[PDB]
Amino acid sequence: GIVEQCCTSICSLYQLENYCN
Amino acid sequence: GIVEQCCTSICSLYQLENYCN
Amino acid sequence: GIVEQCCTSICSLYQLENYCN
Amino acid sequence: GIVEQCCTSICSLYQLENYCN
Amino acid sequence: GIVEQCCTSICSLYQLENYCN
Amino acid sequence: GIVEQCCTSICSLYQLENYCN
Amino acid sequence: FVNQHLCGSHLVEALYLVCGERGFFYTDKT
Amino acid sequence: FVNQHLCGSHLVEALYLVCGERGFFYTDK
Amino acid sequence: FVNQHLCGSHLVEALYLVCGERGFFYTDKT
Amino acid sequence: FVNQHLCGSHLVEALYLVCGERGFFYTDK
Amino acid sequence: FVNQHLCGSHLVEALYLVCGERGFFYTDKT
Amino acid sequence: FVNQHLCGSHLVEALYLVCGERGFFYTDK
Ligand SMILES: Cc1cccc(O)c1
Ligand SMILES: Cc1cccc(O)c1
Ligand SMILES: Cc1cccc(O)c1
Ligand SMILES: Cc1cccc(O)c1
Ligand SMILES: Cc1cccc(O)c1
Ligand SMILES: Cc1cccc(O)c1
Ligand SMILES: [Cl-]
Ligand SMILES: [Cl-]
Ligand SMILES: [Zn+2]
Ligand SMILES: [Zn+2]
């Protein structure tokens, strides 16, 4: 999920917005 | 609201955990 | 000013990117 | 101390409280 | 107080180092 | 630059001040 | 623990450490 | 277990800027 | 995105993520 | 020497939330 | 250096970098 | 690519305390 995906490679704001709401 | 209980008024620890999963 | 547009007044995203290189 | 102990493994709030006062 | 010298009033760098070990 | 230099070894405030203005 | 208003990223951050492994839910304003 | 715990620190904070008012859940596992 | 005043390190931080690889310029007050 | 220096960043900040008014010392060595 | 009020984690953080290897003491309010 | 991206987080923030009003550029490459 977010952590595997964003703590390995840099999530941009756009990718991060995916995990809202 | 966590915001309305811990930003507009001060919050205790307990009071914070209310908002854990 | 970024400060005068995003601290003294609220800023949108767009409005922020104005200040990228 | 705190750094060996908390920068290797995750200190919870509780463990961290140990290094107060 | 660091708080009363650097939060209630502005602090210089020097003024901050007063509070190093 | 700053990142090679400060993300490998600890830049002190003094070293960091170098990349101002 | 702090007797202070936690107002933003600080709110989140706080939650982050208060909750830990449990995890959390941030609604923002309501 | 820090480097995912120190990482997350940042994620929650950035999920805050980006999610604005919609909110988020932070959980896994 | 936040409908909020971004006032300090938060300003910078924001820029940091908004801009990313592009990079940024912080003048502070003007 | 960052990854303990970037780590500490977080520790001091979290020692701030938890220690409230009692205060802390941050030192080692 | 900033001509600003440093008010919280920011206070601490600041100290953290101002002091560095030396280290520091945070009493909070007094 | 985080550990330079999480590092930078800190650098920009500390470049803010130290550079006060003069300002900085943050870029490379
Ligand atoms: C903004 C951010 C922080 C940490 C990791 C990431 O992938 C993205
Ligand atoms: C809260 C926190 C931050 C960094 C490391 C830890 O072990 C705990
Ligand atoms: C203040 C700071 C943060 C991160 C890396 C450094 O070298 C210095
Ligand atoms: C990635 C992860 C797992 C479990 C709890 C959390 O808060 C985060
Ligand atoms: C762990 C450590 C050693 C020496 C000074 C410090 O501020 C922290
Ligand atoms: C080090 C680096 C390269 C390119 C863009 C940046 O914001 C930072
Ligand atoms: Cl603030
Ligand atoms: Cl980090
Ligand atoms: Zn703040
Ligand atoms: Zn970090």
Swiss-Prot record, chains H, J, L:
Substitution effect: H10D: In HPRI; Providence
Effect of F24S: In HPRI; Los-Angeles
Superkingdom to which the source organism belongs: Eukaryota
Residue spans crossing the bilayer: none
Protein name: Insulin B chain
Species this protein is from: Homo sapiens
Gene this chain is encoded by: INS
